[PDB]
Amino acid sequence: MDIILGIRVQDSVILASSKAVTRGISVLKDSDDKTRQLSPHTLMSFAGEAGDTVQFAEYIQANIQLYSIREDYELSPQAVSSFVRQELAKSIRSRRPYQVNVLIGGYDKKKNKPELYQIDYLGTKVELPYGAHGYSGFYTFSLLDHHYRPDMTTEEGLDLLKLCVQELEKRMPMDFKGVIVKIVDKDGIRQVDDF
Amino acid sequence: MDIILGIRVQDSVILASSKAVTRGISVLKDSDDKTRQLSPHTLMSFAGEAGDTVQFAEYIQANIQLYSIREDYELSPQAVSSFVRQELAKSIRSRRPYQVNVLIGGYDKKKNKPELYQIDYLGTKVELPYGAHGYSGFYTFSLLDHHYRPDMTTEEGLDLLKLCVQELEKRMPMDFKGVIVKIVDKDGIRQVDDF
Amino acid sequence: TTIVGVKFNNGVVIAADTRSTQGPIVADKNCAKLHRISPKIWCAGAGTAADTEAVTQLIGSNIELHSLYTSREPRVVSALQMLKQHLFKYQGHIGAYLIVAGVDPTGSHLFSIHAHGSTDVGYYLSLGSGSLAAMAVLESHWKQDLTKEEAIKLASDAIQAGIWNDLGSGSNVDVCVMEIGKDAEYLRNYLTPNVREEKQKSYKFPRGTTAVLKESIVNICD
Amino acid sequence: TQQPIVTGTSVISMKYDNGVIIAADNLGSYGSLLRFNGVERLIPVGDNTVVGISGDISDMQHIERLLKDLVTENAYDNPLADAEEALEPSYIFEYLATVMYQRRSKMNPLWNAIIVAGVQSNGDQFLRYVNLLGVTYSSPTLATGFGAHMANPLLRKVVDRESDIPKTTVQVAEEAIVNAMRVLYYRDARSSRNFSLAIIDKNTGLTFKKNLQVENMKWDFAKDI
Amino acid sequence: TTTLAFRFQGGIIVAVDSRATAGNWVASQTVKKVIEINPFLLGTMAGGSADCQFWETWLGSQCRLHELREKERISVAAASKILSNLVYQYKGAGLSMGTMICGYTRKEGPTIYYVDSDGTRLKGDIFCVGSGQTFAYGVLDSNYKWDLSVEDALYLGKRSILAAAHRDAYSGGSVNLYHVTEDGWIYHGNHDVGELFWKVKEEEGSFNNVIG
Amino acid sequence: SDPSSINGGIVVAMTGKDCVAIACDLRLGSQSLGVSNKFEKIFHYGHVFLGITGLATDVTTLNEMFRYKTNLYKLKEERAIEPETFTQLVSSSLYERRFGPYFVGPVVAGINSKSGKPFIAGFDLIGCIDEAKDFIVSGTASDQLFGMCESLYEPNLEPEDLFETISQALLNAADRDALSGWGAVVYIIKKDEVVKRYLKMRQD
Amino acid sequence: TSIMAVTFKDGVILGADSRTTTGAYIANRVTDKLTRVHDKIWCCRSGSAADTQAIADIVQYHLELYTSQYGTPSTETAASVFKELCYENKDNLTAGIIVAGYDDKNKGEVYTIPLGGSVHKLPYAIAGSGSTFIYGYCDKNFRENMSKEETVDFIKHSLSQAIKWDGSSGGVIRMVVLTAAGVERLIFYPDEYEQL
Amino acid sequence: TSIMAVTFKDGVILGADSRTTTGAYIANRVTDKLTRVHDKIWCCRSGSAADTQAIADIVQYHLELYTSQYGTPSTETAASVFKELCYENKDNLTAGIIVAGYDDKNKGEVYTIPLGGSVHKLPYAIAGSGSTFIYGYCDKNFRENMSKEETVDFIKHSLSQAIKWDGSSGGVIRMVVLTAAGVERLIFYPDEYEQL
Amino acid sequence: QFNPYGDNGGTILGIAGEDFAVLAGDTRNITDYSINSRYEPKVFDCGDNIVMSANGFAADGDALVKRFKNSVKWYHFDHNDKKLSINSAARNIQHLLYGKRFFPYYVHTIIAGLDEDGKGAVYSFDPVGSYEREQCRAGGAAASLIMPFLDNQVNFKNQYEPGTNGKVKKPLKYLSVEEVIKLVRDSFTSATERHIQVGDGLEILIVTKDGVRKEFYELKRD
Numbered sequence A, B: 001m002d003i004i005l006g007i008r009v010q011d012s013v014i015l016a017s018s019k020a021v022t023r024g025i026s027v028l029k030d031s032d033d034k035t036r037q038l039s040p041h042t043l044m045s046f047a048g049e050a051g052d053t054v055q056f057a058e059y060i061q062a063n064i065q066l067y068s069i070r071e072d073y074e075l076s077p078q079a080v081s082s083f084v085r086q087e088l089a090k091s092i093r094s095r096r097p098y099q100v101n102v103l104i105g106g107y108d109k110k111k112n113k114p115e116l117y118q119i120d121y122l123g124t125k126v127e128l129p130y131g132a133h134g135y136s137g138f139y140t141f142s143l144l145d146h147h148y149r150p151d152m153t154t155e156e157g158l159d160l161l162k163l164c165v166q167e168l169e170k171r172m173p174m175d176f177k178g179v180i181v182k183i184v185d186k187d188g189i190r191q192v193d194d195f
Numbered sequence C: 001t002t003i004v005g006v007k008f009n010n011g012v013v014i015a016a017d018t019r020s021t022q023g024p025i026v027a028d029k030n031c032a033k034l035h036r037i038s039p040k041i042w043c044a045g046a047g048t049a050a051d052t053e054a055v056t057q058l059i060g061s062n063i064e065l066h067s068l069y070t071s072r073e074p075r076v077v078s079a080l081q082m083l084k085q086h087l088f089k090y091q092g093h094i095g096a097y098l099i100v101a102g103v104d105p106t107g108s109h110l111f112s113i114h115a116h117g118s119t120d121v122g123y124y125l126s127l128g129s130g131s132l133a134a135m136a137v138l139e140s141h142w143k144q145d146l147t148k149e150e151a152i153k154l155a156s157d158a159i160q161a162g163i164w165n166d167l168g169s170g171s172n173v174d175v176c177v178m179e180i181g182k183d184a185e186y187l188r189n190y191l192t193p194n195v196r197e198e199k200q201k202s203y204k205f206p207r208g209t210t211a212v213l214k215e216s217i218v219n220i221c222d
Numbered sequence D: 001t002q003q004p005i006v007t008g009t010s011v012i013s014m015k016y017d018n019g020v021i022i023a024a025d026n027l028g029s030y031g032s033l034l035r036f037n038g039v040e041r042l043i044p045v046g047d048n049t050v051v052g053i054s055g056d057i058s059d060m061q062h063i064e065r066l067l068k069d070l071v072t073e074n075a076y077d078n079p080l081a082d083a084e085e086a087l088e089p090s091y092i093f094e095y096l097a098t099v100m101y102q103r104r105s106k107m108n109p110l111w112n113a114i115i116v117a118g119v120q121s122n123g124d125q126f127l128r129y130v131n132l133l134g135v136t137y138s139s140p141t142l143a144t145g146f147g148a149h150m151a152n153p154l155l156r157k158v159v160d161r162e163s164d165i166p167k168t169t170v171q172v173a174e175e176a177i178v179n180a181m182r183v184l185y186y187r188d189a190r191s192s193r194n195f196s197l198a199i200i201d202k203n204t205g206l207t208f209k210k211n212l213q214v215e216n217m218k219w220d221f222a223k224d225i
Numbered sequence E: 001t002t003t004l005a006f007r008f009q010g011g012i013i014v015a016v017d018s019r020a021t022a023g024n025w026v027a028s029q030t031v032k033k034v035i036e037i038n039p040f041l042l043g044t045m046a047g048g049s050a051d052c053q054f055w056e057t058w059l060g061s062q063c064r065l066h067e068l069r070e071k072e073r074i075s076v077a078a079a080s081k082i083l084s085n086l087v088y089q090y091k092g093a094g095l096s097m098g099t100m101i102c103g104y105t106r107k108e109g110p111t112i113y114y115v116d117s118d119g120t121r122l123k124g125d126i127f128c129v130g131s132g133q134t135f136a137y138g139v140l141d142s143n144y145k146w147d148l149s150v151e152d153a154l155y156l157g158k159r160s161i162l163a164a165a166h167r168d169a170y171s172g173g174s175v176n177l178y179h180v181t182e183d184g185w186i187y188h189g190n191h192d193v194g195e196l197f198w199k200v201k202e203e204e205g206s207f208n209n210v211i212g
Numbered sequence F: 001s002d003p004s005s006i007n008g009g010i011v012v013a014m015t016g017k018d019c020v021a022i023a024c025d026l027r028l029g030s031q032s033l034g035v036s037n038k039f040e041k042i043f044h045y046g047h048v049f050l051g052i053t054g055l056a057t058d059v060t061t062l063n064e065m066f067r068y069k070t071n072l073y074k075l076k077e078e079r080a081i082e083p084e085t086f087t088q089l090v091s092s093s094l095y096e097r098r099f100g101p102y103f104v105g106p107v108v109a110g111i112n113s114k115s116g117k118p119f120i121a122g123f124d125l126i127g128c129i130d131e132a133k134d135f136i137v138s139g140t141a142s143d144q145l146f147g148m149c150e151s152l153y154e155p156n157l158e159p160e161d162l163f164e165t166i167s168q169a170l171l172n173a174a175d176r177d178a179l180s181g182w183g184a185v186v187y188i189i190k191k192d193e194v195v196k197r198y199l200k201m202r203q204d
Numbered sequence G, H: 001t002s003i004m005a006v007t008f009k010d011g012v013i014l015g016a017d018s019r020t021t022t023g024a025y026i027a028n029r030v031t032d033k034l035t036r037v038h039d040k041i042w043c044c045r046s047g048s049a050a051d052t053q054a055i056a057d058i059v060q061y062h063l064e065l066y067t068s069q070y071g072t073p074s075t076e077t078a079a080s081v082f083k084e085l086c087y088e089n090k091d092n093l094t095a096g097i098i099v100a101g102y103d104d105k106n107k108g109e110v111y112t113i114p115l116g117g118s119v120h121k122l123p124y125a126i127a128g129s130g131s132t133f134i135y136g137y138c139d140k141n142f143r144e145n146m147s148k149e150e151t152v153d154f155i156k157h158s159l160s161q162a163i164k165w166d167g168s169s170g171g172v173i174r175m176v177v178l179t180a181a182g183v184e185r186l187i188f189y190p191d192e193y194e195q196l
Numbered sequence I: 001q002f003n004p005y006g007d008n009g010g011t012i013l014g015i016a017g018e019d020f021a022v023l024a025g026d027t028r029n030i031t032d033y034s035i036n037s038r039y040e041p042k043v044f045d046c047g048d049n050i051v052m053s054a055n056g057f058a059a060d061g062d063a064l065v066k067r068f069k070n071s072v073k074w075y076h077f078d079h080n081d082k083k084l085s086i087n088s089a090a091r092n093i094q095h096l097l098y099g100k101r102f103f104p105y106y107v108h109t110i111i112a113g114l115d116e117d118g119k120g121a122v123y124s125f126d127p128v129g130s131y132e133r134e135q136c137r138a139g140g141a142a143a144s145l146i147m148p149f150l151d152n153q154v155n156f157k158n159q160y161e162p163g164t165n166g167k168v169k170k171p172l173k174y175l176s177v178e179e180v181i182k183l184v185r186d187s188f189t190s191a192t193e194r195h196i197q198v199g200d201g202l203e204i205l206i207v208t209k210d211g212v213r214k215e216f217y218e219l220k221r222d
């Protein structure tokens, strides 16, 4: 775990997530996908404590998929984010809390708008134009403050994202083995293979 | 600090030393030379506590240079290594010990032989065909056990060293921003600029 | 806090200051520390402010139900027993230090309860951070066979000692007089010896001083 | 770094129109054990100053010796040792205050609260406090330990500010002090009934009263409880 | 703190914020974090205010004594090493300093040295130091080229502090700009973030996260 | 790791002549890192306004909880809850979590629709009601707000004057606290109109 | 506290001081540490005021319920109920209790229950912080089958010494006399006992 | 330890038990806790055996050097030297010392020096762990200007009780009589004192 | 374990005008919840038209003032009775404070006076010697209450010109001594209301070219 980013542009949400899975002094894997598709137009990236992250992500995934089958209907990104926040808000006062931070990128088909939510392990939710978890934020937020515009295209958003990854690869102490980028828009979720 | 390696081959000693100087969540420099020339045919790389490393390296450098001027003569790599070990052996029972680990690569002109010494901050000296300090050893020692031969050329030693750096770049958690390689032989010390 | 209780001829009087603190900061300059458990049983509370309020209300609620059940006016010893058994159960974690007083068919009564659930009896009592300033006054001036007006004077003087000399007490003096055969009279702000002096200047700003970015009407209706 | 062993409790004092009064019980406590009953915690320096000390008694006895030595040293090569160049209360205080702060700064404090009561050569009342931390302050009424919590409130009812001092007589002041000592006996668990009281007046001088007792105590109401 | 200094075609730019903090209490908004050692040397301050302030003005006295004794302005390397050797003597004692010794000399040219309280001393072209260093890096690195004009470099330095001043809770107040040339340092004014933010937001079109 | 000062934020409420004002900052951070400059801390249930400072997850949770409770109240009572009653509800709900509390500093503000009286109240994290004639403060810059309000405030201010006072109270307090600021919102509340204003303040 | 109970010819007498402390502050200088659990079964309370009170109340409840079913309980029975509470809750209690009662068959009896919750039947018992100072005195001066006046003097002189040395003890000396005649409360003030 | 010193008509008597403990083990059951610092100035030692011994030896050295220059030192002087050592090294010492001596001018004198290093001149003094149990008894029974036989009985009965209750005290009761006549050592065995 | 520090409470305040400067401080001295003295001054005239206050731990405060006063005395002896300028005093104090960097004086120090151009000057220090000249500074227990009020009223922060659309700031101007004393008195009454360690009395020292004048005002004693 470690690096998860998110950028909401005009017509889409772009989630970048590091590929490295490190443990002790060994990078065990360099092609890890730190994301789950909750619904056709909703994607959740995650970072935090080992085990907890995937266990939580798949638990949320199951619940949202169960809802989809029951109602024959896709929950809005806002509704999913509120459900996730509540699960974490319960968790924090449990015997053993989930130590997982998440970003939820979704395209609301009713509003025809991209939406990016940032939720930490305490259950602290915020809607943002761009978001990051962990130490990444300390570099990317100020970078995006400068270069981000609300009316950018998906291509412009990817170039803006390349600028973040470059800055992190320059100044971050740890090797995070690049990122897997995914785009969420009106046509659903797709992965950029060459980044 | 972090990664310092050493390989003694047929006719030379090769020292590789990481270029990164990290502090907190920021790589402050990616072109740092973690080495000092003690004498024309003796090179010392170093790694450890911030401040201590350079302070110790330059203190040793001054002493060896002072000896060279006084006697109009170059100390043998063995003699320098014994001097350095004693300084660290004093240090460890001081009020504030030097927390510095070193490798001393030298070419003994009287014996016409390369020599590599590994000395830790406790004052533990060993002569080796190949050496490493810190977590690097956990990967490179077993690698060199397999691929190292005592009669290799300097070119073969560099290829053997490339194999170490590749393995470290693959499996080490931290980005150490490559290495500065230096060769110590009968003609003195020179730096490989393209590594 | 500073709180006191004093017995007299035909009843009992309690009093309290009106300061509430959060570290060195005065949170409330005129809080009410005198609490009604039943019409003629009142409680003065020091310690954790929420605990004194909550524990007094809970027992007050159960006392009312008990009074209705038994068709009798509640007794101070019932409130004392219920409070102490509740506080003891929580091993001091409910930080309520109370002076319980009142009149009932048995007579007039004065008790104190500590957070851990121990109870005292006395003719004069004081609790809180300014209890030593108060108790000094009570030990100096108290006597047997006090009249009503003497007891109020003694009680308010003991509270004043705390107001002036204790940093945890200040502002005003609340008093509650519980006399036998009469209605209990709650004297909110019986003394107000700490009125703020006129400010030197009006800090009313010229309209338009604050820079505004957006305006909008908020819909409160359905 | 210390911990106090044998200790003395409250020292109380106040100014009145012509001078100052100071008092302190005769107890040397050893934790909860009321060990020693013949301890004098008021120590006169000359005929114009009394130093009242609470806290560690071994450190008090050390301070006694310092003051005793200060009188000796002041007399050396001093033809006016019993006249113009006699030890003033202010000199005695400042010396102690210096020592107390130097000891706290060396992390080895004299574990005491000290009140220096006296009358200056010009007739002015001197009353000032100093403790193990080197903290100093002055007030119309001063008290240490439990005295600060119980005596001061009572004494401040008599002299609440500077302007009340000329209006307070030695009879009124002593009465308040003796009352405060009684209250402390009721409420302080490390106090004793027996105490000493000292009056330093600008006209009548130093009057040192020993073997006083707390009396006129109210205990009768206990039978009803 | 956020302080930076970077080397470029036209010399050195140095930029700092002006906030001082005691925990979450904002102790000051008008602090001078650049100390002018001589007409060709600058020092930046980050970490403990007393530590920085005391030892860097002490450094200035040592540099003055050098040019009296040696009849020559001290080198940026030598000046930085006086400070680094000093703090190394106090290593472990608890000094907190993040400094940058920026200046020009004939033999060295424009030079920047990072010096901190655990005894690290580094020559380099770009450094950001302080609690908000990462925020400054983000903007500075993504816009830095060697061939920046004096006008563009001054703005980038100003904009990088503004970026950090905004995000970092323990940075802010105002921006102090300096430009070091072969002729010495030149002060380019105090810029209050109160006005500078809105001026930059409007003109640049950036800071779209904020309610306009 | 002090729950009440991880995210940061402040709320202040004042009374005027036949009106009340409640104001808050917009910052949400994670200690030093500022994360959001749109995080509002004032909510309303009918005509009763509630500001909440402290741990942001609890701020959100409590808002959702009081919306829940006031909605059921209205369905059963067939009328909007009043400030005095809501204050009691808040106190009950907080003390219900006595030994596992919400790390919050709520502030009730509003005008009683029956009597027309302005009402403000504050609470500690554990439910203790702090009623006031003049003003209530809460958050990481409460000390600052106490000092600003105590000096600037005067009784019976007109809505337009009260706006200036409460705004200046919040703004100057926020600028002395690292974890507060990043924008501000002020609600001016009259008997049957409410005006919401976003303040221009320094963004550091 | 300084407390004690002493058996004699006609029955048993309980004795106690009246000081309650919170640190070195005396919270109550007129405390009643002698408490009735039954008509002629009383106890002296030392240790935590809250704990001893809660225990005494529970015991009083048990013995009242015992009396309603099986008539007057023995002093031994009363001590067993105290023990049961003190022993089973030893981890959460700081209570040193002396139980004393008068039967007509068994006459005066004294049981002491220290911190652990063990029971010890004795001719006389002493307890509380101030008891340490009078072990020497009480052992030398106690005699079996004393008269009422002798036992009152024994307790008065004993608690006088305990009070004199122990800072945690003081105030008045309360006593409770348990005989066939009935129950008699005695009080003795400082002005009398201090100058013994 | 249980130790005590008592002044009387003809001079002063020191008394002590003989038990030395390392935990609950008795390392020495025949210890001599009464030690000579001068011909007719002795001291009772309580606390750390090593500390009190080292102090006593230094004091004995100082008083021997005093005697060589200024003749016989007063008992007060001896106590001042003890105090000086105990006070100035209070952080590193665990010593409770009673000093007792006979002058011809001042007759019998007793000074007690507790842990802090303070000095207290008394008619009689008690100290050590077992002293707590006899404060009551000793206060009630001590009289000024007792005879030799009365003072011996007072100490014997006192230390008997101290020994009986204190586990850290026991063995024999040693005594040292300081008068104008000279120095007399007394010893009393369990079989005598236990059944007092 | 022995704790060499303590907190004697109180608060101080310095404001600079065009040709004058004031240094104010309350006269209350406290430990924990007890008042030690209602009138214990901590603002001192140190000579050369320099007034000084070191608020926090009074023993360290008195020690520092004592040392600086002594530093002024020796500055005269060593430099031919030259007047110590306020800027030079400030630098001297930094060395006094930093001298004890690893066992600090637990005090917020403020000095006030006139600079060498005759204009009002206030310097303020942290406990280890960092200093800065300002128009305005509050120090001590109630510094967090008073300081933001000063920012608003002395430096006109967050105050814009009415009708200018929050574009033109309220212009900075020097305040008259009458206006400054109004702000000081309102600051301290407000601080006294909401801070328990502040009260009893207010003593202001005003510095002009003519010398040092004093003014005293009663504060609330609760």
Ligand SMILES: *[C@@](C)(CO)[C@](*)(O)[C@H](Cc1ccccc1)NC(=O)[C@H](Cc1ccc(OC)cc1)NC(=O)[C@H](C)NC(=O)CN1CCOCC1
Pocket (backbone or CB within 6 Å): C001, C002, C019, C020, C021, C022, C023, C027, C031, C032, C033, C045, C046, C047, C048, C049, C050, C052, C053, C095, C128, C129, C168, C169, F124, F125, F126, F128
């Ligand atoms: C005096 C003023 C305190 O010295 C009184 O005891 C006063 C009692 C009181 C009673 C009813 C209404 C108002 C006031 N006590 C307080 O005001 C109290 C002081 C206190 C604070 C913290 C404590 O635990 C560490 C104990 C006592 N202050 C409060 O209750 C304030 C309003 N609340 C808090 O500080 C919140 N605390 C409560 C305990 O849990 C931790 C947070």
Ligand SMILES: *[C@@](C)(CO)[C@](*)(O)[C@H](Cc1ccccc1)NC(=O)[C@H](Cc1ccc(OC)cc1)NC(=O)[C@H](C)NC(=O)CN1CCOCC1
Pocket (backbone or CB within 6 Å): E001, E002, E019, E020, E021, E022, E023, E027, E031, E032, E033, E045, E046, E047, E048, E049, E050, E052, E053, E094, E095, E096, E130, E131, E170, E171, I104, I126, I127, I128, I130
């Ligand atoms: C930013 C604001 C983050 O703090 C900068 O690092 C800033 C740099 C600076 C430089 C010169 C002048 C002013 C400001 N640092 C501070 O403002 C500094 C932060 C800090 C506090 C304590 C530290 O402990 C080692 C380290 C850094 N603030 C202070 O120094 C404040 C004014 N003073 C104190 O906290 C007093 N402390 C200092 C340490 O010793 C105990 C007393």
Ligand SMILES: *[C@@](C)(CO)[C@](*)(O)[C@H](Cc1ccccc1)NC(=O)[C@H](Cc1ccc(OC)cc1)NC(=O)[C@H](C)NC(=O)CN1CCOCC1
Pocket (backbone or CB within 6 Å): C114, C116, C118, G001, G002, G019, G020, G021, G022, G023, G027, G031, G032, G033, G045, G046, G047, G048, G049, G050, G052, G094, G128, G129, G168, G169
């Ligand atoms: C003497 C004074 C000392 O042992 C007695 O044992 C006395 C017995 C007594 C008191 C009143 C009524 C009947 C009997 N005990 C006390 O006065 C007691 C001292 C004590 C407190 C706590 C203890 O261990 C937990 C042991 C002894 N005082 C109190 O209980 C007072 C009223 N409350 C406190 O001191 C507050 N305590 C609560 C428990 O935790 C420590 C703080």
Ligand SMILES: *[C@@](C)(CO)[C@](*)(O)[C@H](Cc1ccccc1)NC(=O)[C@H](Cc1ccc(OC)cc1)NC(=O)[C@H](C)NC(=O)CN1CCOCC1
Pocket (backbone or CB within 6 Å): H001, H002, H019, H020, H021, H022, H023, H027, H031, H032, H033, H045, H046, H047, H048, H049, H050, H052, H094, H128, H129, H168, H169
């Ligand atoms: C009675 C037994 C208990 O207080 C006496 O005070 C007695 C005095 C004595 C003994 C012999 C000769 C003359 C006088 N003291 C001891 O027997 C003493 C007990 C004691 C030990 C250490 C203490 O504090 C450091 C206090 C009291 N016993 C010893 O010194 C024995 C010989 N040694 C040990 O117990 C070993 N100690 C060394 C010090 O640290 C703890 C372990």
Ligand SMILES: [Mg+2]
Pocket (backbone or CB within 6 Å): C162, C163, C164, C165, C166, C167, C168, C169, C170, I221, I222
């Ligand atoms: Mg007060």
Ligand SMILES: [Mg+2]
Pocket (backbone or CB within 6 Å): E164, E165, E166, E167, E168, E169, E170, E171, E172, F203, F204
């Ligand atoms: Mg900021």
Ligand SMILES: [Mg+2]
Pocket (backbone or CB within 6 Å): H163, H164, H165, H166, H167, H168, H169, H170
């Ligand atoms: Mg034995």
